[PDB]
């Protein structure tokens, strides 16, 4: 899609996990890493990396 | 005027003035322009040839976002991408309504993407024959790749307007750059109205430790 409300929701969630970066379960960290993957594929390059 | 330079080409507009930040591409631009311009010039164009390159007066090093349309307005192009000095073109009015809806600014007289800190508005092709979108694609092709690749060395985010027009944009660029392709303001079914590209760009900027764009600066009162 690239430019939808749904895309914005995902990027805002990625940004939120990035600002904390203090994962206390496997879900949060795999959510972070899988969002990075999606954002990289969708937008070609993004400023955050997997962890 | 010292941060500005000029080079000579062999066809109108004969002189191209450019900000220092463009220096690395100017030799190539001359060579490319000299080989196609006379073909280009057989046609009346938007913008006029004396305005083809006026956006090269913009610095690039303070730029975080490029907002890119495929080519100039079919008529009345000013050499500043998206610019409509008396606020008449549909696309600039639509962009402005999006920004109005986003920022809550409701009374305005104009909007210009070129007076926003951090934004470089851009037309991929630098002219068209009057009245006919994309008619100069064939002539601008190498130049367009040259210049957009240069821009994308500087900006964090490239935002292209036109799903169809930019479906192949990654292929025209060398090094990856954050690239959002959204609807053109004239898309069917009010789809541009639903598009959240300006907000997306700001989140992407934050993800890149960059300052988001203050889109309300574009308003003219």
Author numbering:
A (entry chain D): 0 to 50
B (entry chain B): -2 to 218
The authors write:
Vaccinia virus DNA synthesis relies on three proteins: these are E9, the DNA polymerase bound to its heterodimeric cofactor D4/A20. The function of UDG is to prevent accumulations of uracil bases in DNA molecules due to misincorporation of dUTP or spontaneous cytosine deamination by excision of the uracil moiety and initiation of the base-excision repair pathway. Here, we present the high-resolution crystal structure of a complex formed by D4 and the first 50 residues of A20 (A201–50) that are necessary and sufficient for binding.
The structure of A201–50-WT is almost identical to the one of A201–50-T2A: the effect of the mutation is strictly local and affects only the mutated residue. The loop connecting the two helices (residues 20 to 27), which is not involved in the D4/A201–50 interface shows some variability when the two complexes of the asymmetric unit are compared (data not shown). When this connector region is excluded from a superposition, the Cα atoms of the two complexes present in the asymmetric unit can be superimposed with 0.29 Å rms deviation. In A20, two stretches of residues form the contact surface: residues 1 to 14 are located in the loop structure at the extremity of the fragment and within the 1st helix; residues 40 to 47 are located at the end of the 2nd helix and in the following loop structure. Likewise, in D4 two stretches of residues form the contact surface: residues 167–180 and 191–206 that are present within loop structures, a β-strand and a α-helix. In addition to the flat interaction surface, the D4/A20 interaction uses steric complementarity forming a tongue and groove connection involving residues Arg167 and Pro173 on D4 (the “groove”) and Trp43 on A20 (the “tongue”). The crystal structure of His-D4/A201–50 highlights the importance of several Leu residues (Leu7, Leu10 and Leu14) of A20 for interaction with D4.
